[PDB]
Design a protein around this nucleic acid. Structure first.
Ligand code: K
Ligand code: K
Ligand code: K
Ligand code: MN
Ligand code: MN
Ligand code: MN
Ligand code: MN
Length: 136
RNA sequence: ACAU
DNA sequence: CGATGT
């Protein structure tokens, strides 16, 4: 209904899908970039959206912040809730890095706690999430 | 269909 | 146009 401006917004960016994946987190209120992940040579949109949320959880927990996280990814929100990233990406040598990061993110979820609300950014009403890469 |  | 996902 109403945007919660006191929040962290996250998003993936890619060159190809599957392709080069990165992500970033921004202050929803100001657009200030709070974190950015070095590009990963091969991954999927959904793996990156998932890594972005989990990194957000870790970032806010480390800083003792109760802000919610916005994501535009129905898929990634569900994967975080399930603590399981149900990606179809083949596991092979060239996908090893993204899969290691995904496996490590799931492992973190399974060994830590958080109350952070993970909210759907309503693109149809509000436009692109503030962490968007501007590539579409 | 909806979400990327 | 095509890919990733529920
Ligand atoms: K979008
Ligand atoms: K984009
Ligand atoms: K589809
Ligand atoms: Mn997105
Ligand atoms: Mn796993
Ligand atoms: Mn985007
Ligand atoms: Mn388009």
């Amino acid at each position: 209904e109403e945007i919660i401006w006191e929040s962290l917004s996250v998003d993936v960016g890619s060159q190809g899908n599957p392709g080069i994946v990165e992500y970033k987190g921004v202050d929803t209120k100001t657009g200030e970039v709070l974190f950015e992940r070095e590009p990963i040579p091969i991954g999927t949109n959904n793996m990156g959206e998932f890594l972005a949320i989990v990194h957000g959880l870790r970032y806010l927990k480390e800083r003792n912040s109760r802000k919610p996280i916005y994501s535009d990814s129905q898929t990634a929100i569900k994967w975080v809730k399930d603590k399981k990233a149900k990606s179809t990406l083949v596991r092979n040598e060239e996908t090893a890095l993204i899969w290691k990061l995904v496996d490590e993110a799931e492992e973190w979820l399974n060994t830590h706690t958080y109350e952070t609300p993970i909210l759907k950014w309503q693109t149809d009403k509000w436009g692109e999430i503030k962490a968007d890469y501007g590539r579409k």
